[PDB]
Amino acid sequence: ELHNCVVVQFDGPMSFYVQMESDVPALEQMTDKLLDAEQDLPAFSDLKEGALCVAQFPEDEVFYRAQIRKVLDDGKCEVHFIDFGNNAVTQQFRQLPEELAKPARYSRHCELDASTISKCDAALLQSFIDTRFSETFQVEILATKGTGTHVVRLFYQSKNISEKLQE
């Protein structure tokens, strides 16, 4: 029971987000629809935590489904791109059609059993993972907590990455 995915964001073995090779088809179509409607999307002003909408990714310049995580100053907010998993600060918000708000997030928050983490406590694991953003990893979902976060085992080319926390 191992599914292909890609680690898009890493904050540790306790907090990271991936993109299941399964949901890619849906995600692409989402992006397609968002790119064509973008220009004509209305301005978004209800700026408060948890507010769903469409924010502009400073790097891409493209708008994506986002959730306001923290309201800062000068109309700048830290937002979380639900279909990716990374956050950013921006000032560009446009409304998200209800039709396009129905789908589920396309990036899944995961973590490894904390009970099996660190034998040497590897912070170089961050490096090992980031060095391979362009690569395909594998996960076996042990469960999904009431929060939506999967508890998982991480694999790279058949090898369990936890092995990178010990000798």
Partner: peptide
């Protein structure tokens, strides 16, 4: 990349 933008 992945479902990003063009």
């Amino acid at each position: 990349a992945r479902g990003r933008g063009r």
